[PDB]
Design a protein around this ligand. Structure first.
Ligand SMILES: *[C@@H]1O[C@H](CO)[C@@H](O)[C@H](O)[C@H]1NC(C)=O
Ligand SMILES: *[C@@H]1O[C@H](CO)[C@@H](O)[C@H](O)[C@H]1NC(C)=O
Ligand SMILES: *[C@@H]1O[C@H](CO)[C@@H](O)[C@H](O)[C@H]1NC(C)=O
Ligand SMILES: *[C@@H]1O[C@H](CO)[C@@H](O)[C@H](O)[C@H]1NC(C)=O
Ligand SMILES: *[C@@H]1O[C@H](CO)[C@@H](O)[C@H](O)[C@H]1NC(C)=O
Ligand SMILES: *[C@@H]1O[C@H](CO)[C@@H](O)[C@H](O)[C@H]1NC(C)=O
Ligand SMILES: *[C@@H]1O[C@H](CO)[C@@H](O)[C@H](O)[C@H]1NC(C)=O
Ligand SMILES: *[C@@H]1O[C@H](CO)[C@@H](O)[C@H](O)[C@H]1NC(C)=O
Ligand SMILES: *[C@@H]1O[C@H](CO)[C@@H](O)[C@H](O)[C@H]1NC(C)=O
Lengths: 320, 170, 170, 320, 170, 320
């Protein structure tokens, strides 16, 4: 009469690793690493991203004319921008504190584009002359739509005094610019006054900008440059502009009406009319696993990222 | 193994045993076949299940990358940013792999320990009332019904009972 | 346990034993009661004490936060600062918890291993000169004085002595 | 005759965790995590902190008149400052490189406030006219005490040339300012000269500052602004100031006479006439434990910080 | 040890054994001397060799310092740079030391486990056909040639053979 | 007849540590920690480093006259510079974005020193007058060799217009400077024109520099200062300079012809005519070990760095 003590076994081929032994075949294993993605960009819990296509963030916020698609943007779950967008600044120049702005952006889900200085309020100055071949719209010359390139009116440029008070409850993103001509002739031909400035003040901002008249390379066919500058105008604060030339005035600004979880994704991956709880620059993830290896930069509720190629937990015993 | 029993004194596993993890095999006039243990398998299920949750949970406070941009005159801080994010990515990749390597070894030795523990709850109740082949099998100095095996399973093997024909079998 | 002895072949613990960690119990005409082991308990005291110091000492090169301020145009580097300090706080919180989880398991199995080791320093000296109940108790094929037990404690159990009445008890 | 092998047991309820099992009751445990604090701010080994109360570091070093309590400060073990101190700059403006300064501060235990340019040395300029309602002292108008707001003397502002050589063995913290008026009238009414500057030189410093005359929001009832600037004047170096207006001159500077372990704590927790070897923004710690969970930012000899809620080391065996 | 055998039931080591790691000693009319085991030593060689490579390999994704300079108005970020590099240096110094401390303990207990496993592949084949001194030695109830020991080494000890003079020796 | 089961033992004294026990003597151990170095600076795989000796990186790239040894430098494997090089700027001043430059440097193995503006091309200006006692060469006065300090020619300084187009395939490092005099007399004595500027433009650079005439400490016997500025001139871009005084013009620039693994080592350790695969500021490493403890900052193929004093792996069993 014969009784034995023994253990389970099966026809399984799933392998684990240990410190002493690799590929120890086991009875029961649990893979805990997500290795795959749907290869599309998707809605994040029902909210569509903003796909900037061929436009950069600057091109968007200044309103480069090739970016008309983005004149009015709905609320987004996250932002997607190419590595090298073709439409940025039609007119060459610098965008001051650009990265700090994108950082701000990344904590923002929606803007309302509001008008802060009316294009009809410039009686003593020309407000539509005012365009460049560097920024074309359908063959004809144009300019960034959110700002107004003021020009002299009949051989004179009186001192602009303009202010705007923030009567809203939300912060405002205000943008403006300075034109740097190539020589002093174009300086007089544009603004009459040879020596000029732009002062900009708020309760925390105190800036004076002076044009830099100099000879540079043509970029986009221009040797002149335009530098853009921004601030966050708080509720009940006012912004005051004073200039006697070279002023690229605001027309519109952006009201910050929704804040929360966002990011600016770098990707070329097509939007694919899907919906996900976790998104990566390479594609979306639908998994119950706690680890993945697709990309470090994700948004949503995601598995934790690792660089591993395989990651399996032995649950059963050594197979035979 | 580390406890000598799996892939040791008990050479292989029983395909016919799909009743559980660690079981017995009874072989008496009435019938052959297998039967698993419950207070042995289940206790191993909890321990392995709890361990898995523990590993995962211990891992959800891990570092999460964030994108930050920099201009061409911020090369030092951008490089600092890159090295500090890979730095943490490498730490957590190290931690997860290493906790998997180490628990795998323990999970395997846990099983082995639980089989050897089983072989010794039966043996230390059978005394000199049975043969010990040493292959993970036991032969009797007496007769055993199908529900007699159930005494040595349940843990309630009656010693002040079968001693007569055991001692006299010699 | 993992070595089958604590919460295994030795069901529970002895409240009356507060003399040490791993002890014996003698029960002869002269008197009942408990007595602990010293070369067993003490050796466990060192090992556990050393481990504690090791854990703590291994932990004093851990990351220490520092406050740094930033203006409203340093939002990227301030965020970098925040993530790198939490980053290290999380790493060290992970390390300390995990080294506590893992050593706890080992400390418990160390104890278990040391009890089972004890049960086997007595058994492998008693041979066929005594009964093995299998509950962590031993009955004799001979008579044992109070200072006879002290022979099996001290490690000096005299085999070329008691063999006569042991063999003839059968 | 019966001898048994067994183990210790007791009436204990202390629990530990392990990888497989949580709350394993044990025979002997050692808690290694400090969870409590005395809830007061304390002396650090016999040295009292500097409790700035309602003043900020700037308010202190410039000598905002509401901060007279801090005109002379003894050596401190650490500094405590509120989240939003009410007395900072009575007169609105910017404090240049403020955070870099606080960083310097944090490695400093004591200053000696010394006089570097004597208030009596301005014969050709008015040195007490010189005050604003923005910085009141007992109803009447005043100014930051460490600096001197120079004004024109009888319709003239000759060019200031002033220098100071550091005859001490310690480094000096030197502070000075520039006034930015609202319009050019106040500019002439204050300093006579319409176009002005401040040059500041040392062996490493070379600065020119120009006033920014512009229209801003009233802050503290003022639209003018004052920007403050600092340097570390090394031993045997000299500092040279040249200005023809808008100069907010130094009167006093701070000699760095003690360096070592300090910090700037953010807290609202009352000072409590106690003494400790380890201090946290929430309160002090008196413990022999190697870990605590009170706050990451501490000073003194402290346990290492963790985020754990419980942390207990099993020393004994499983209980029954 | 942890498995009771090294520095336990087998008091010391054999200097005369330089044939391998875990061996036997035969002592019959023909000749004394030692002989090691191969399927025991070699299996321990692989396991220890693989472990070493594993530790090192697991360690080559570790943080590498980089020099970055800063001006006197970058004191906050320079300090951030210093703390983040020491931060990672401390983490990896912690990881390497701790993985060495922990594997050392395991490597030692692995050996111990493999000796005790050896003592039990011989014992569980010798049954009642031999004496068990309990010091890591075995005496016979029968006669054994030099190539008879080679049967218990090879694993092929013939039981349906020597049973006659063993049973009758009592 | 007697057969025993036992284990190996030996006369070894090598010790390991474990969690419970320190100094457990063992049968077989493997030390995995490299603790020693040859104490020399060496070639890195056959390529000699650049040992700057008593010169700093700035002194090199501007061509301080005491650094003639480095007028032409072969390709280097890495750079070595002292803690406090005596030859930096002979003439006192600032080197703008110095650290960002060194960062760039550190990814560079070789420059070609090319001429971008010919010293013979200044017909309307004096190009050799042009030197200072602050930068002596063999007793007589000199200047940084890579740049040209322009001076007025016969009581006149006409407006410089000069440009240079990058006809190469490699990026260029272009350097130039501005002179800040002490008083307006020296300003007129040097450059005739009292109010001056330097504009510098590229396709991304747009700079205007104005001299700061002020009184400073003598440094190297001078109170005037010279600030140096640089850019990376891309292939097919041009750089345009316009100035009416105070211009320290480029003569030569550096072509970036080899990029790859380099570093800037701080060390005083003599070069020792050896060759190594792994180099540290303290000396070279020749080892098969995977860890060392010599220094964190290395270059080449190296063991990973730790702070440990000992690190030994137990391979054998406990000794007796
Ligand atoms: C383990 O198996 C995998 C098969 O994918 C192989 O990559 C690896 O080299 C193997 N190693 C060992 C030890 O068998
Ligand atoms: C903004 O206008 C509001 C509304 O009257 C007022 O309270 C506030 O003072 C104004 N701010 C400025 C900067 O003029
Ligand atoms: C996501 O996975 C779940 C679970 O298997 C499934 O129900 C669902 O179809 C998946 N979604 C997509 C887009 O395939
Ligand atoms: C462990 O006990 C604690 C009681 O405070 C409880 O929080 C936890 O959920 C328990 N877990 C288990 C496994 O019993
Ligand atoms: C500072 O005065 C000392 C004392 O005579 C002198 O050595 C030093 O040159 C002076 N420094 C300046 C900047 O004038
Ligand atoms: C600090 O703790 C020690 C040790 O128990 C004690 O002597 C002392 O009274 C404590 N200090 C305070 C302020 O309670
Ligand atoms: C271990 O031995 C070393 C000898 O170098 C010594 O530094 C250390 O204190 C010793 N510790 C123990 C536990 O023996
Ligand atoms: C550089 O010269 C090249 C060669 O003709 C030309 O393509 C390019 O436009 C020039 N760039 C500038 C800035 O003039
Ligand atoms: C480097 O070590 C190797 C290996 O032992 C040896 O061949 C060589 O001589 C060593 N090089 C030097 C410079 O000593």
């Amino acid at each position: 009469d014969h009784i034995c003590i023994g253990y389970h076994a099966n026809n399984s081929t799933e392998q684990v690793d240990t410190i002493m032994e690799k590929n120890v075949t086991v009875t029961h294993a649990q893979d805990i690493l997500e290795k795959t993605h749907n290869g599309k960009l998707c809605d994040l819990n029902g909210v569509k991203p903003l796909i900037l296509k061929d436009c950069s963030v600057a091109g968007w916020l200044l309103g480069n004319p090739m970016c008309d698609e983005f004149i009015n943007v709905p609320e987004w779950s996250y932002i997607v921008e190419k590595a090298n967008p073709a439409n940025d600044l039609c007119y060459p120049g610098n965008f001051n504190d650009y990265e700090e702005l994108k950082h701000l952006l990344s904590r923002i889900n929606h803007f309302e584009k509001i008008q802060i200085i009316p294009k009809d309020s410039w009686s003593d100055h020309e407000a539509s002359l005012g365009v460049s071949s560097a920024c074309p719209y359908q063959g004809n010359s144009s300019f960034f739509r959110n700002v107004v390139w003021l020009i002299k009116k009949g051989n004179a440029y009186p001192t602009i005094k303009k202010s705007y008070n923030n009567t809203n409850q939300e912060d405002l993103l205000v943008l403006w610019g300075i034109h740097h001509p190539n020589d002093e002739a174009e300086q007089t031909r544009l603004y009459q006054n040879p020596t000029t400035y732009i002062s900009i003040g708020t309760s925390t901002l105190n800036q004076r900008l002076v044009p830099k008249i100099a000879t540079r390379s043509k970029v986009n066919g221009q040797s002149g440059r335009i530098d853009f500058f921004w601030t966050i105008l708080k509720p009940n604060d006012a912004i005051n502009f004073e200039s006697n030339g070279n002023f690229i005035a605001p027309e519109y600004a952006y009201k910050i009406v929704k804040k929360g979880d966002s990011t600016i994704m770098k990707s070329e991956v097509e939007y694919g009319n899907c919906n996900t709880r976790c998104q990566t620059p390479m594609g979306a993830i639908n998994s119950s696993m706690p680890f993945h290896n697709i990309h470090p930069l994700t948004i949503g509720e995601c598995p934790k990222y690792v660089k591993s190629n395989k990651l399996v937990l032995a649950t059963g015993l050594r197979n035979s | 193994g580390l406890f000598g029993a799996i892939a040791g004194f008990i050479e292989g596993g029983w395909q016919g045993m799909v009743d559980g993890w660690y079981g017995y095999h009874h072989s008496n006039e009435q019938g052959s076949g297998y039967a698993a243990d419950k207070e042995s398998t289940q206790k191993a299920i909890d321990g392995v299940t709890n361990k898995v949750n523990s590993i995962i949970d211990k891992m959800n406070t891990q570092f999460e990358a964030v994108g930050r941009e920099f201009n061409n005159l911020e090369r030092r801080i951008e490089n600092l940013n890159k090295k500090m994010e890979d730095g943490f990515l490498d730490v957590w990749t190290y931690n997860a792999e290493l906790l998997v390597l180490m628990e795998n070894e323990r999970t395997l030795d846990f099983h082995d320990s639980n089989v050897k523990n089983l072989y010794d709850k039966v043996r230390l109740q059978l005394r000199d009332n049975a043969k010990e082949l040493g292959n993970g099998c036991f032969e009797f100095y007496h007769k055993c019904d199908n529900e007699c095996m159930e005494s040595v399973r349940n843990g309630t093997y009656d010693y002040p009972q079968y001693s007569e024909e055991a001692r006299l079998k010699r």
